[PDB]
A paper describes a structure:
However, in the presence of sub-inhibitory concentrations of ERY, ribosomes translating the [name] leader peptide become stalled, leading to an alternative stem–loop structure in the [name] that exposes the RBS and start codon of the ermB gene and thus allows ribosome binding and induction of ErmB expression. Previous studies demonstrated that polymerization of the [name] nascent chain halts because the ribosome is unable to catalyse peptide-bond formation between the 10 amino-acid-long [name]-tRNAAsp (codon 10) in the ribosomal P-site and Lys-tRNALys (codon 11) in the A-site9. Here we present cryo-EM structures of the [name]-SRC in the presence and absence of A-[name] at 3.6-Å resolution, which were used as a basis to perform extensive molecular dynamics (MD) simulations. In conclusion, this study illustrates how ERY exerts a dual effect on the PTC to inhibit peptide-bond formation, namely, by (i) restricting the path of the [name] such that orientation of the P-[name] is perturbed and (ii) stabilizing the A-site crevice to prevent movement of the A-[name] towards the P-site.
In silico sorting of cryo-EM images yielded two major homogeneous subpopulations of ribosomes bearing P-[name] and E-tRNAs, but differing in the presence (termed [name]-APE-SRC; 85,393 particles, 33%) or absence (termed [name]-PE-SRC; 75,839 particles, 30%) of A-[name]. Both subpopulations could be refined to an average resolution of 3.6 Å (using a Fourier shell correlation (FSC) cutoff of 0.143; Supplementary Fig. 2), with local resolution calculations indicating that the ribosomal core reaches towards 3.1 Å. The [name] nascent chains of both [name]-SRCs were well resolved within the ribosomal tunnel, as indicated by local resolution. Moreover, the electron density for [name] in the [name]-PE-SRC was essentially identical to that in the [name]-APE-SRC, indicating that the presence of the A-[name] does not significantly influence the conformation of the [name] nascent chain. With the exception of the side chain of Asn8 for which we observe no density, we are able to present a complete model for the [name] nascent chain residues Val3–Asp10. Specifically, [name] adopts a unique conformation that enables it to bypass the macrolide ERY bound within the tunnel without even contacting it. In the [name]-PE-SRC, there is no clear density for U2506. However, upon binding of Lys-[name] to the A-site, as in the [name]-APE-SRC, U2506 adopts a well-defined conformation, which is similar to that observed in the accommodated state. In both the [name]-SRC structures, the density for U2585 is weaker than other PTC nucleotides, but appears to predominantly adopt an intermediate position between the accommodated and unaccommodated U2585 states, hinting that the Lys-[name] is not fully accommodated as suggested previously.
Residue numbers in the entry:
A (entry chain BT): 1 to 93
B (entry chain B5): -8 to 0
C (entry chain BC): 2 to 272
D (entry chain B2): 1 to 46
RNA sequence: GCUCGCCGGAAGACCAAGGGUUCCUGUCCAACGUUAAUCGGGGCAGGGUGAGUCGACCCCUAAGGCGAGGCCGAAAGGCGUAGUCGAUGGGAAACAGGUUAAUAUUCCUGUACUUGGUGUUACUGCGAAGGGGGGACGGAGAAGGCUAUGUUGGCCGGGCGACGGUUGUCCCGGUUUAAGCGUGUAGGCUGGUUUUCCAGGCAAAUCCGGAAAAUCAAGGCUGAGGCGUGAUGACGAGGCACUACGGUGCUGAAGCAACAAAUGCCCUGCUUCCAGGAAAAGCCUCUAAGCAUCAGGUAACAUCAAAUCGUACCCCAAACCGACACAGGUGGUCAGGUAGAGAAUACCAAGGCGCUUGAGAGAACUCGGGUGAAGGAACUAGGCAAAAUGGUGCCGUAACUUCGGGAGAAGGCACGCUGAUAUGUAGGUGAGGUCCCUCGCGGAUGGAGCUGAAAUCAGUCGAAGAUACCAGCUGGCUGCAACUGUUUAUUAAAAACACAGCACUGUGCAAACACGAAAGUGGACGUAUACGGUGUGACGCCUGCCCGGUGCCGGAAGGUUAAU
RNA sequence: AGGACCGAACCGACUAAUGUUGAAAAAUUAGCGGAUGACUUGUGGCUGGGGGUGAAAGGCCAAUCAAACCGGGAGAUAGCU
């Protein structure tokens, strides 16, 4: 479990979006990108400690990187894992 | 399509 | 009691069913059932080692008590049952200990009969006892070729094997083929004969009748081609060539037998 | 008319996958030739 | 935006396969689009795929693959045991409403459910890789009982008609609600309980099985659907209200009955027939090696966990497969109204489209069609192609025959609408009332209401009433093949092939034969009433003669003769 | 009851027209045969080149089959153009 050092890398970067703001102002579910692996529990604990707020339930999904191309040469982007961390009544920032 | 057939004259 | 079919539509007119009313309709005694997947006539190599075999209805194998090892214990028939694998009907006898095993059915067999295997057993049909106890000339079937091996002989319906001689440790046997063959007296054998003598009467009656039997259509070699079969060509049927197997072995008038090791047991060739 | 090509990834990986190449020495020789030739794709998958 | 036109058993909708951001939005028009293009499945950028209970992963196994040792083979390698992998199979559990520009059984709202870990309490013999049970299965057929769904009536809301009528027996719309839980009906299957004994189920057994008794007659299992609950709600036509004119909040009436009814369910049933119809685990039980005040087992409550991966879009196509935005190909599932036997077909609902060049002119000729006076095959290799026949009920029907056929032979009549019989009949469905009940989802009695053909008589309209679509041309002689099928994918569907049957021949099982240098399999877990090969080709009448040549079998003296 | 009858789906491809640098490297249109079975089809395996398979056309084995395709011997040979 913790093993803080493993948990610290889970929260590489928040993923802001117009839908996520609606998710926060209504569903109170913060949205952010996570590690390519990890699990529903570590993502929860990462909010339980560093974000110092209680989690109601965690959700996960993986967005495939759209393929790009230039001339005969082609270039795929990179896959990344969006996460939906629902917050309780104790939500702050 | 080219076909085949024969030329038996 | 065969009943010829009425001529309602073609493929039905020539059919002759062989109904057997005394057979017990219903689901088979389940635990002794076991899988018998179709081979298709192919071997491990996947080559068709034997032609004209494939398709047909699925069949489930049933163990049969050839050895009849349970000597002394009285047995009683419960019910007759059909066997897809064999021309002979099978029967489910009940041993007094409650154990049940399938056995080939003698013509004299009926429900409730008290058949009993054993060296001391009385000479009545349906018993399976060693030939050393068997009187000369009695009808016999399910004869073991080896002591306790089972009983490969006379498994087919309507078959019977008379014992014309008993000189030495060996007892001579008269096969249904008419070929004579010595067999050791120690081997077990069933008295009487199997009752499915009507089995020859069936005539299928349609082109599709062989399809569920796993039989496949036969193509004559004269209709083929020289590259595929030695027979063929000639522009308009014809023939000319001496008849042969596709692999070239001479058909009609050539003994393929070559065992030598078992020649001692062969008192006489079949007639 | 039905085309000869009737794609199915499951048959594809089983018939022409890396594991099929490793199934026998003759298949390993294929990979050895593809490596000696130099190739972006030693096999095919995803 | 207002209309027209097409499909509507799809050209609608969904899943899988496969594709891999084509999905949504903003913006752009070089190239891509067989045209212009502000548009697009095109360029660029951003956004989008939310799972304990959908599926995969997972447990189990089929045909098979691989394969510790082993067997075999110049080497490579081949075969194969114990094993392991292998779904197109089986194996625990989420349904309705709402929301987004795109995702919803995933989020939210409401009500739930399964399997384990842990804790408390109660009772108690618990325990396999083993035994048994269960899982666990065919074709066809017959109905019956029901639901999805539809029609009508009632109820509620709305409407008095652009032109003669329309406050009435009028018109329009709605009348929708699941899983779960309780109840265990229409039915289907089986006689239950208890005692004793046993050569069986590799060990054991309280279980299965077998054998003796006793006792009692309903004991149990399975099971749709209905009725309650879930639901004081939710949804809801239509209004009140702000309004980026693209919508958002609030409020919100009735929400029943009767009939019809499936290809869906009871049904893995029942009946019946040979062609006799997978495999293992989960599951229910049995003990052994063992623990035996424990651990465990069962039950009520509480708590925790249910991970990983797929989730957007296309799905009979513009995106899959066809080099194309190609008249081709692509499995399953959902099955509205009227007419009709019907999933045929016509017109329509929901819904999706008018198929990515148009505007004209109204020549030949060509393609797709309509009609044609007189003749009716005179055309032509040939009735090729068109034309024609076409439905239901009934009358009636030859030669010939293997007595099933031929046969729907052929050839005719009747067919619309309306009234009466009967203001809707025969039937079907079935409420109230009455009575019987070991009293339930009962039975009898009773007949309202609803639904509803078919027939007779009379009257009536058209040239035509199976009026459209849909929908056999028929007879006679004869060749060939018995027939049903199969065949040259892409010029030959046949007299060719197959065929049941008949005959010959090989084969005694470690069979002949066949694959394979071998090993090992197939034949066959079959046993001469079986199997292989060859020929012939249903059935009826039959099937003559020739062994010189050729082939083969049988015979063993002699002639001849290899290696040695 | 049926390798039974008529007839959609489904399967098959007998006739004729159109098409013949087609919309399509074999289709469309109007008819046709089978349609409870020797049926059809989804999914996944098995038989590998003098071999496979074949209700037998020497057909089919990835649009090619009286001997597939790929690479190699190989710049084979060619008294021929």
């Amino acid at each position: 479990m913790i093993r803080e050092e493993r948990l610290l890398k889970v929260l590489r970067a928040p993923h802001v979006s117009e839908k996520a703001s609606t998710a926060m102002e209504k569903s109170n579910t913060i949205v952010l990108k996570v590690a390519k692996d990890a699990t529903k529990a570590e993502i929860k604990a990462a909010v339980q400690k560093l974000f110092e707020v209680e989690v109601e339930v965690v959700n996960t999904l993986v967005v495939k990187g759209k393929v790009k191309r230039h001339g005969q040469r082609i270039g795929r982007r990179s896959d990344w894992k969006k996460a939906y961390v629902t917050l309780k009544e104790g939500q702050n920032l | 399509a080219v076909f085949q057939m024969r030329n038996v004259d | 009691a065969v009943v010829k079919c009425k001529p309602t539509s073609p493929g039905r007119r020539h059919v002759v069913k062989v109904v057997n009313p005394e057979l017990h309709k219903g689901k088979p005694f389940a635990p002794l059932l076991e899988k018998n997947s179709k081979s298709g006539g192919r071997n491990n190599n996947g080559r068709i080692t034997t032609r004209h075999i494939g398709g047909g209805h699925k069949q489930a194998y049933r163990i049969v008590d050839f050895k009849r090892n349970k000597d002394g214990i009285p047995a009683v028939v419960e019910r007759l049952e059909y066997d897809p694998n064999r021309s002979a009907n099978i029967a489910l006898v009940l041993y007094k200990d409650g154990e049940r095993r399938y056995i080939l059915a003698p013509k004299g067999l009926k429900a409730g009969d008290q058949i009993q295997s054993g060296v001391d057993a009385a000479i009545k049909p349906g018993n399976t006892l060693p030939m050393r106890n068997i009187p000369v000339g009695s009808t016999v079937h399910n004869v073991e070729m080896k002591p306790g091996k089972g009983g490969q002989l006379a498994r087919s319906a309507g078959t019977y094997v008379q014992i014309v001689a008993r000189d030495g440790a060996y007892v001579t046997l008269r096969l249904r083929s008419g070929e004579m063959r010595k067999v050791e007296a120690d081997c077990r054998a069933t008295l009487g004969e199997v009752g499915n003598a009507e089995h020859m009467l069936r005539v299928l009656g349609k082109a599709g009748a062989a399809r569920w039997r796993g039989v496949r259509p036969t193509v004559r070699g004269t209709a083929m081609n020289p590259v595929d079969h030695p027979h063929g060509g000639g522009e308009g049927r014809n023939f000319g060539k001496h008849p042969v197997t596709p692999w070239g072995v001479q058909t009609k008038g050539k003994k393929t037998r070559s065992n030598k090791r078992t020649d001692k047991f062969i008192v006489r060739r079949r007639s | 008319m039905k085309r000869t090509f009737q794609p199915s990834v499951l048959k594809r990986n089983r018939s022409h996958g890396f594991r099929a190449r490793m199934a026998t020495k003759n298949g390993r020789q294929v990979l050895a030739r593809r490596r000696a030739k130099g190739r972006a794709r030693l096999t095919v998958s995803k």
